[PDB]
């Protein structure tokens, strides 16, 4: 098990210390930020708050905004 206070499908250390979302074959994989791999792909390094379901207090979680499973 891994702790997840806000219950938004992404653990606490990733939200505090930086994460990103990447695809490998056709599946999306949320991963902690590694500069040696996620800079050559040209990705973004997100940081959110580990005790809010949505850091900007709007009705779309931090998981959905980064994953794209959201209102289009």
């Amino acid at each position: 098990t891994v702790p997840d206070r806000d219950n938004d499908g992404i653990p606490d250390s990733l939200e505090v210390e930086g994460y990103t979302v990447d695809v490998k074959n056709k599946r999306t994989f949320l991963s902690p930020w590694i500069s040696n791999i996620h800079e050559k792909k040209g990705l973004t390094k997100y940081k959110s708050s580990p005790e809010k379901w949505s850091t900007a207090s709007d009705p779309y979680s931090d998981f959905e905004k980064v994953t794209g499973r959201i209102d289009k």
Partner: protein, 98 residues
């Protein structure tokens, strides 16, 4: 009204619903029991507003989340600088340091 011709239209408030995701089947379904008047006062109190008309003289109001140091839940948000807010909210960049 026929003498002076002054009649305008104010806008006091706006009702309207949110449509959230459904993990079960991927669809997006409007929930009819929640409007934005439960949401927008919570955005207006934990964020910071930046208005900007550098794109052909049109004001583009945005709001970036920012820390309030007298609230224990709001002090958990990441530290947001003015350069980072201008970079991620509008689309500034620094190709030569500037």
């Amino acid at each position: 009204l026929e003498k002076t011709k002054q009649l305008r239209l104010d806008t006091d408030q706006v009702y309207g619903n949110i449509a959230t995701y459904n993990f079960e089947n991927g669809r997006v379904r409007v929930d009819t029991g929640s409007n934005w008047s439960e949401v927008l006062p919570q955005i207006q109190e934990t964020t910071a507003r930046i208005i900007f008309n550098g794109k052909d003289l049109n004001l583009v109001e945005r709001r970036i989340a920012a820390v309030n140091p007298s609230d224990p839940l709001e002090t958990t948000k990441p530290d947001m600088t003015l350069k980072e807010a201008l970079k991620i909210a509008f689309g500034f960049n620094e190709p030569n340091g500037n």
